[PDB]
């Protein structure tokens, strides 16, 4: 609880970034219940799936499926509305006029966390918290509070594992693999 | 990381109200050091000892002895003038303006952390953090964050007994103990 926030945030981002291919596993919990999804990430490229739903992103074209509706709609996403779920993107609020301090809590063995909170008062979420392990800068925790609302929002990281390698196909739609599903392509 | 924070808040000090004579060992870790304490606690009485340094206050008189000085200066404190360094007096910010939200840490099994935010962005702190546990409701952590500054606060509590019984005498400077100080009074 002694080092600074933002070179531990800065630490910690880097490793992301140089860890290649990456499957991480999480859970949100909020007030109305609890998911889970799995993300694979490869530069800007993703797949997110969740119950009921996927995603591919090939760094250029998004196409999403919903079971309920056994449809997947495609469309190009601006870098603002892209919906990666990726918990690692928090720490990019440190460069958005979001104040940094660092401490340690412990009982298990103590982790970092790291306080994100908003200069400007009508940004939404007010305050975000990191969970950070010491040693490999692997974030366990995110937790996110809303300005205007009292319930918190937590994403777990469940696992995560680094240095994948996945085709460029990977990340493409493959409709042989959804034969009854309309395609609604909005491009 | 379901309940409301208010009510585990008002649970946790209401154990400690009912809980009797206490003896509570911390130790703060800041910017520029660590250091630790013992803390004894009935009612509105206590005694409190660092290294170099103890304090008895009777509800009324306080003593304090400076060991580097070998002097116990003698006064009267008002309500706000009392340090206690009770880490449970923290809990009573939420009744002067903090907002509270609840969430929940682990990794060694989790405990609550409830966040307060000071509505005020005059006051100082900014915001405190508390950890408590989910069954005895028993605060591990308080850390405190400056409005101005960049460092944190951490307050452990290392050792808390309850239902102790403590003579008035026990919160009473005894000279016998202190043969050579200077006894200075301020009153």
Chains 1, 2 share one sequence.
Not at 36 to 65: I, N, P, R
Not at 93 to 117: A, F, N
Not at 140 to 149: E, I, M, N, T
């Amino acid at each position: 609880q002694q080092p600074d926030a933002k070179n531990i945030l800065e630490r910690t981002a880097e490793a992301f970034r140089k860890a290649g291919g990456v499957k991480l596993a999480f859970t949100v919990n909020e007030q109305q219940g609890s998911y889970a999804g799995v993300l694979y990430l490869e530069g800007e490229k993703f797949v997110v799936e969740t119950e009921g739903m996927k995603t591919w992103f090939d760094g250029h074209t998004q196409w999403s499926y919903v079971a309920s509706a056994d449809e997947v709609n495609v469309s190009e996403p601006t870098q603002e509305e892209l919906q990666t779920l990726n918990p690692y993107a928090w720490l990019s609020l440190y460069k958005q006029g979001y104040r940094l301090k660092l401490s340690s809590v412990g009982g298990d063995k103590s982790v970092y966390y790291i306080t994100m909170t908003a200069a400007d008062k009508r940004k939404d979420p007010e305050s975000v918290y990191l969970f950070v392990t010491k040693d490999t800068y692997r974030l366990h925790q995110v937790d996110l509070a809303p300005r205007g609302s009292k319930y918190m929002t937590t994403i777990l990281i469940d696992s995560y594992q680094t240095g994948q390698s996945y085709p460029d196909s990977f990340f493409v739609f493959d409709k042989k693999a959804y034969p009854t599903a309309e395609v609604i392509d909005m491009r």
